Design a protein around this ligand. Sequence first.
Ligand SMILES: NC(=O)c1ccc[n+]([C@@H]2O[C@H](COP(=O)([O-])OP(=O)(O)OC[C@H]3O[C@@H](n4cnc5c(N)ncnc54)[C@H](OP(=O)(O)O)[C@@H]3O)[C@@H](O)[C@H]2O)c1
Ligand SMILES: O=[N+]([O-])c1ccc(S(=O)(=O)c2ccccc2)cc1O
Length: 315
Amino acid sequence: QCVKLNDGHFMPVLGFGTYAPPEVPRSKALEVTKLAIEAGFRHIDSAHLYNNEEQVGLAIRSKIADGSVKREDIFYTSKLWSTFHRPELVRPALENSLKKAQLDYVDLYLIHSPMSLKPGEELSPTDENGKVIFDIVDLCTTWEAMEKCKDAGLAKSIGVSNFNRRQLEMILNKPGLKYKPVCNQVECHPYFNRSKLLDFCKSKDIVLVAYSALGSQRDKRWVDPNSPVLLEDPVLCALAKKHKRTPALIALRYQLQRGVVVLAKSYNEQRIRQNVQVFEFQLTAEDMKAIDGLDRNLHYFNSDSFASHPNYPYS
Ligand SMILES: NC(=O)c1ccc[n+]([C@@H]2O[C@H](COP(=O)([O-])OP(=O)(O)OC[C@H]3O[C@@H](n4cnc5c(N)ncnc54)[C@H](OP(=O)(O)O)[C@@H]3O)[C@@H](O)[C@H]2O)c1
Ligand SMILES: O=[N+]([O-])c1ccc(S(=O)(=O)c2ccccc2)cc1O
């Protein structure tokens, strides 16, 4: 199942999340991406940040070589990291990602975040207090460099991630805009359902792609351990019982029925296969209203590291 993007390309509506934190051996990304493709995932979400593009690209190429899929059947995303927002760094960052994955093109290239970081060797250049050292880049200039990557054929489609409405607006209002973003990949789940941003995106034919749709991996670098655990929510668990599915499947299905493309990360073979069951059942209107009731403005990523960045998207 795919949605048509505003530049005519197609995005599968369920995607596999590939991030795992640095304690997880790098080889695991190769194994679990092949599992995801075997289970029926066709959209695969990676990034420079993830330090896994080589393993994820090998898993794709393995499944092409063994005859399981064709390249045109796979929708592969990577993302421009925030130390590469200066326009002359954008096509190089993309070419690096293509070389790591050994692919000729990515289906989608995103600006990973609006929170530009000091250019240099470090992924996360940190000040005195562990705040990211910010850079000031007009992201409209970064966008123009993204458009040139599409014109060169390095990315089939281009989009953004972690933009708020006003930051998206800034791009859509750019003089001489050539390509709208096709999507805005953002934190989105029943505790932070982004209904206003969703309505804006739909008005502009921009796909909202939900990450941390299962509640995030609750990494201690970014996530308060006190934050309620999404999949323990009693309304999600009651709906799981009513449908004889699981709280994760309820959270994924919720998004599809709102018109949201949804990612799901799992490094567990059973849960990878379980997550494709999202296409096998439906939530009723009352189930969806119950889930809408859970909204509490909770973005799990909530650290000082970035909450003080001048382009921090949350307010
Ligand atoms: N653009 C950005 O800034 C950004 C930010 C965050 C994430 N992302 C992308 O979005 C992807 C997904 O988000 P996420 O990594 O935060 O994780 P997530 O999809 O919200 O999943 C959270 C946790 O759910 C568990 N899980 C998966 N399926 C389950 C099931 N059926 N039942 C119970 N638990 C289940 C997984 O644990 P197991 O592995 O143990 O199954 C996983 O660690 C990322 O991997 C990345 O691709 C992008
Ligand atoms: O789990 N991931 O996939 C992932 C983890 C961390 C970040 S981040 O840029 O630190 C960030 C920081 C703050 C808010 C949003 C994003 C990007 C990611 O994509």
